[PDB]
Design an enzyme around this catalytic site. Structure first.
Site, short mmCIF file in Angstrom:
data_model
loop_
_atom_site.label_atom_id
_atom_site.label_comp_id
_atom_site.label_asym_id
_atom_site.label_seq_id
_atom_site.Cartn_x
_atom_site.Cartn_y
_atom_site.Cartn_z
N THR A 24 -68.55 5.85 39.10
CA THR A 24 -68.61 6.66 37.86
C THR A 24 -67.57 7.76 37.92
O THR A 24 -67.48 8.51 38.89
CB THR A 24 -70.00 7.30 37.65
OG1 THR A 24 -70.97 6.27 37.38
CG2 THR A 24 -69.94 8.30 36.45
N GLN A 25 -66.81 7.86 36.84
CA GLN A 25 -65.74 8.82 36.76
C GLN A 25 -65.79 9.61 35.46
O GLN A 25 -66.83 9.76 34.84
CB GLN A 25 -64.45 8.03 36.87
CG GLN A 25 -64.47 6.72 36.05
CD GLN A 25 -63.17 5.94 36.20
OE1 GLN A 25 -63.10 5.02 37.02
NE2 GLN A 25 -62.13 6.31 35.43
#
Lengths: 233, 244
Positions: free
Chosen positions: A1-2
């Site tokens: 997740t970014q």
């Protein structure tokens, strides 16, 4: 997740009687800073397909490399690479759709909204969408982000249902795309005036126009607008 | 004593590695194939013995491309050749992925070299049963190479391997002498078709099918492409003519 950093806004597109049209401005924003202007967000693959990408630019550049590699690979031990066994738009899409979904399923998405536009070998128009969630769909018109709200309504007034495709001409169609780009320049605070447009016609092939500009804008009335209610001068 | 030739990484008393030498025998027993470097590229060609009429013509292709600018042809155990190209293809993708620029031919050559040489270090594997001729155009010119089962390789002006390697090597030595200024892509293509027709005598019993490919900075833009149709026929003729 970014979390996305450098991003590209809308990607609008639609299909007409002999092919499909797709456009995207050349901006690469960094939050509210309109940082980069020479960003091409239209990726041509082969000569029957164009991939329009929005979202994180770094992830886009990555999908760009995957696409070039897909071509190089398809060429290996393939004597019909520029004929019966050249890449189809549907192959390019199924691949990208596959990747997008796997990545979202590993909790590490490619922060993008993609639209694959092209013409199948049998002449059929191809227009489908896929995003960071792996969600996919097709429609006579398709747009991402802001364009989904402002472009689709306009473009749909031309091609409202399937039966309108054969009645629409590249002229009518391209006109709609270009007007939609102007509207987005009016209301999208993350848009650029310069954009790229591409046409994939089953007879004329791929036409890729660079450095276009929003023209014929109405701003004059702005001079009559003063104050915010009661002020007269 | 003896037995020095039953295990792959074993040194015989005379410092040799028999298994590798045996692999070579397998290479010599194969079809003949060549490589002709020219003024701005390289040409590849190979002999395709027509075992029967049942073989679909022009189908069973042998020449192979690596990345988009490298050509590879080999003689010996065909499957071993594909195995080596596969490795080379990975080897190339890896290089481009990190350095962005497509892999230089010299760099690519060492990649195959190190890998092939690797298969002469352990008794748990077998040496490659092929000699490979490959090359392409890059940042500074064209390059032609030939790799042996021992992992040995050098840059060549012209190269040949297989059944009629002597006929070819002979024809190639002539060209080298009578063209110090360098052959041309167009010329090398016909010349190649000829070297192949001549070297076919060392196998004149079976009928064959010629295959040519080339990579020229001017004729193909530095990309590897197969010679087809007219240009091919023109070369077959140039050969069929001078064969008499």
């Amino acid at each position: 997740t970014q979390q996305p950093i450098v991003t590209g806004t809308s990607v609008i597109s639609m299909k007409y009687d002999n092919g499909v049209i797709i456009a995207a401005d050349n901006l690469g924003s960094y939050g509210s800073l309109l940082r980069f202007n020479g960003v091409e967000r239209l990726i041509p693959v082969g000569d029957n397909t164009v991939v329009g990408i929005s979202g994180d630019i770094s992830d886009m550049q990555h999908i760009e490399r995957l696409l070039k590699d897909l071509v190089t690979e398809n060429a290996y031990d393939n004597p019909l690479a520029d004929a019966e066994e050249a890449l189809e738009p549907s192959y390019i899409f199924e691949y990208l759709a596959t990747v997008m979904y796997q990545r979202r399923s590993k909790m590490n998405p490619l922060w993008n909204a993609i639209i694959v536009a092209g013409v199948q070998s049998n002449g059929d128009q191809f227009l489908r969408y896929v995003n960071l969630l792996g969600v996919t769909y097709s429609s006579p018109t398709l747009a991402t982000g802001f364009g989904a709200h402002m472009a689709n309504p306009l473009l749909r007034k031309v091609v409202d249902r399937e039966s309108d495709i054969p009645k629409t001409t590249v002229q009518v169609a391209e006109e709609a795309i270009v007007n939609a780009m102007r509207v987005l320049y009016y209301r999208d605070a993350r848009s650029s005036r310069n954009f790229s447009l591409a046409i994939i016609d089953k007879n004329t092939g791929l036409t890729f126009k660079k450095n276009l500009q929003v023209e014929n804008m109405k701003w004059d009335f702005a001079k009559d607008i003063k104050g915010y209610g009661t002020q007269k001068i | 004593g003896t037995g020095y030739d039953l295990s792959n990484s074993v040194f015989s008393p005379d410092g040799r590695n028999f298994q590798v030498e045996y692999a070579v025998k397998a290479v010599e027993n194969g079809t003949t194939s060549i490589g002709i470097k020219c003024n701005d590229g390289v040409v590849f060609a190979v002999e395709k013995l027509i075992t029967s009429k049942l073989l679909v013509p022009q189908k069973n292709v042998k020449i192979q491309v690596v990345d988009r600018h490298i050509g590879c042809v080999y003689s010996g155990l065909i499957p071993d050749g594909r195995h080596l190209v596969n490795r080379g293809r990975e080897e190339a993708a890896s290089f481009k992925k990190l350095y962005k620029t497509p892999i230089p031919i010299p760099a690519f050559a060492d990649r195959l070299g190190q890998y092939v040489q690797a298969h002469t270090l352990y008794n748990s594997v077998r040496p490659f049963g092929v000699s490979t001729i490959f090359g392409g155009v890059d940042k500074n010119g064209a390059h032609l190479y030939m790799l042996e089962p021992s992992g040995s390789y050098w840059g060549y002006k012209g190269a040949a391997t297989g059944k009629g390697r002597q006929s070819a090597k002979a024809e190639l030595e002539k060209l080298v002498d009578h063209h110090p200024e360098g052959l041309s892509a167009r010329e090398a293509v016909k010349q190649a078709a000829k070297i192949i027709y001549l070297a076919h005598e060392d196998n004149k019993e079976k009928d064959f099918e010629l295959e040519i490919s080339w990579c020229s900075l001017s004729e193909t833009n530095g990309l590897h492409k197969f010679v087809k149709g007219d240009l091919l026929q023109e070369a077959i003729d140039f050969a069929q003519k001078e064969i008499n």
